[PDB]
Enzyme design. Sequence first.
Site, PDB file in Angstrom:
ATOM      1  N   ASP A   1       3.431  -4.277  28.620  1.00  0.00           N
ATOM      2  CA  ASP A   1       2.327  -3.500  29.174  1.00  0.00           C
ATOM      3  C   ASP A   1       2.352  -3.400  30.691  1.00  0.00           C
ATOM      4  O   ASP A   1       1.301  -3.474  31.323  1.00  0.00           O
ATOM      5  CB  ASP A   1       0.991  -4.077  28.685  1.00  0.00           C
TER       6      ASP A   1
ATOM      7  N   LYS B   1       1.992  -1.752  33.985  1.00  0.00           N
ATOM      8  CA  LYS B   1       1.263  -0.608  34.506  1.00  0.00           C
ATOM      9  C   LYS B   1       0.502  -0.995  35.761  1.00  0.00           C
ATOM     10  O   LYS B   1       0.265  -2.171  36.008  1.00  0.00           O
ATOM     11  CB  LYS B   1       0.283  -0.043  33.478  1.00  0.00           C
TER      12      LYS B   1
ATOM     13  N   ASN C   1      -2.390  -3.505  35.673  1.00  0.00           N
ATOM     14  CA  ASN C   1      -2.040  -4.890  35.321  1.00  0.00           C
ATOM     15  C   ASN C   1      -1.216  -5.588  36.400  1.00  0.00           C
ATOM     16  O   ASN C   1      -0.632  -6.655  36.156  1.00  0.00           O
ATOM     17  CB  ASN C   1      -1.229  -4.917  34.019  1.00  0.00           C
TER      18      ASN C   1
HETATM   19  O1  LIG Z   1      -9.051  -8.163  34.482  1.00  0.00           O
HETATM   20  S1  LIG Z   1      -9.081  -8.344  35.905  1.00  0.00           S
HETATM   21  O2  LIG Z   1     -10.346  -8.317  36.578  1.00  0.00           O
HETATM   22  N1  LIG Z   1      -8.176  -7.147  36.573  1.00  0.00           N
HETATM   23  C1  LIG Z   1      -6.947  -6.682  35.937  1.00  0.00           C
HETATM   24  C2  LIG Z   1      -7.180  -5.414  35.135  1.00  0.00           C
HETATM   25  N2  LIG Z   1      -6.254  -5.381  34.006  1.00  0.00           N
HETATM   26  C3  LIG Z   1      -6.375  -4.152  33.213  1.00  0.00           C
HETATM   27  C4  LIG Z   1      -7.504  -4.287  32.214  1.00  0.00           C
HETATM   28  O3  LIG Z   1      -8.694  -3.740  32.806  1.00  0.00           O
HETATM   29  C5  LIG Z   1      -9.778  -3.618  31.874  1.00  0.00           C
HETATM   30  C6  LIG Z   1     -10.256  -4.993  31.484  1.00  0.00           C
HETATM   31  C7  LIG Z   1     -10.795  -5.847  32.440  1.00  0.00           C
HETATM   32  C8  LIG Z   1     -11.233  -7.105  32.084  1.00  0.00           C
HETATM   33  C9  LIG Z   1     -11.127  -7.529  30.768  1.00  0.00           C
HETATM   34 CL1  LIG Z   1     -11.681  -9.106  30.315  1.00  0.00          CL
HETATM   35  C10 LIG Z   1     -10.589  -6.683  29.812  1.00  0.00           C
HETATM   36  C11 LIG Z   1     -10.149  -5.428  30.169  1.00  0.00           C
HETATM   37  C12 LIG Z   1      -8.256  -9.855  36.285  1.00  0.00           C
HETATM   38  C13 LIG Z   1      -7.466 -10.446  35.306  1.00  0.00           C
HETATM   39  C14 LIG Z   1      -6.787 -11.618  35.558  1.00  0.00           C
HETATM   40  C15 LIG Z   1      -6.877 -12.227  36.791  1.00  0.00           C
HETATM   41  C16 LIG Z   1      -7.641 -11.665  37.801  1.00  0.00           C
HETATM   42  C17 LIG Z   1      -7.740 -12.253  39.057  1.00  0.00           C
HETATM   43  N3  LIG Z   1      -8.466 -11.750  40.059  1.00  0.00           N
HETATM   44  C18 LIG Z   1      -9.134 -10.619  39.815  1.00  0.00           C
HETATM   45  C19 LIG Z   1      -9.095  -9.958  38.608  1.00  0.00           C
HETATM   46  C20 LIG Z   1      -8.342 -10.471  37.561  1.00  0.00           C
END
Ligand SMILES: O=S(=O)(NCCNCCOCc1ccc(Cl)cc1)c1cccc2cnccc12
Lengths: 315, 10
Positions: A130, A132, A135
């Site tokens: 995945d 992108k 991510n």
């Molecule tokens: O999820 S995050 O806020 N940002 C990444 C976005 N990834 C794509 C998915 O976006 C939609 C989505 C967001 C949160 C959840 Cl739980 C499901 C779907 C995030 C994940 C892991 C570590 C992080 C650290 N700092 C900030 C944000 C972080």
Amino acid sequence: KVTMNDFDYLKLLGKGTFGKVILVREKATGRYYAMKILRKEVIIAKDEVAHTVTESRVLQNTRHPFLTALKYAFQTHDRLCFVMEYANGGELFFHLSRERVFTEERARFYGAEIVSALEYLHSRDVVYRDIKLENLMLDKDGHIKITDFGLCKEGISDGATMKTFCGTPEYLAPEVLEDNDYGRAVDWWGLGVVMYEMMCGRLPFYNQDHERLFELILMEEIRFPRTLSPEAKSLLAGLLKKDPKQRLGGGPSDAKEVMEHRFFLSINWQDVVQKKLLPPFKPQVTSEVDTRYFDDEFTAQSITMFEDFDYIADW
Amino acid sequence: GRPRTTSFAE
Ligand SMILES: O=S(=O)(NCCNCCOCc1ccc(Cl)cc1)c1cccc2cnccc12
């Protein structure tokens, strides 16, 4: 042991169907983290347990500078919580959307860090599936952090294959849009799409209708801006080869092939993982709770089976 | 700036 009450809950950073990510402060230490909170009842009802378990296992069993690291994992009767290192620079999607396009040198920096992370994952028999812009995040120093490990497949070495139709539509490799199985080369296709976006300012293939989108991915030849360097054109053509056996990284040496491409001639791959190169951009936050690299859409919003899930890191 | 995308599995 760690519980919900060990943290202050400050700001919503991100949100999907299957969870929320909140900026938290650990009360006892004053340290900030990103806490992903999932609802057990929803995860169970919608058959997302396997994905959540995989996400947990990958986080528990990986350690790499360009992978999001897990500090604590814990649960309640109705919730699962991952406490991860906070990436204050937001998603690469945020930055590229603002700037429209990166220089080739800036794209090369991020690309090298992504190749390093993918090499590491592949060396642990994990296929990410995945890649992108959403991510890929930037940490406080401007380094890549890969997130969202729920679609990983474990136990994939050499030319072992996978069957699940999954990923993100716009980023799906052509082989995934055919019947039957595919191998780890899908990750190099993904890298190709993000590199294409970073240097060309758009997806290589796009239509709002998935049927047409999938036809483009399978059938359409990519185009390049006339002014793109020959080495960038060559890299992108190689990573976005539709036949995974002809793709850059698709051969037996996997990431090695990509690292040896002329586009990366200037990269010392050993320096990459050691973080010796000054990043091209450092998030210019004025405090630990400055969420300027996250969309106001989220940050404005007020906030008010799993046997081996619990985890405390050795760092 | 393209629309935000969504991961899936079938
Ligand atoms: O999820 S995050 O806020 N940002 C990444 C976005 N990834 C794509 C998915 O976006 C939609 C989505 C967001 C949160 C959840 Cl739980 C499901 C779907 C995030 C994940 C892991 C570590 C992080 C650290 N700092 C900030 C944000 C972080």
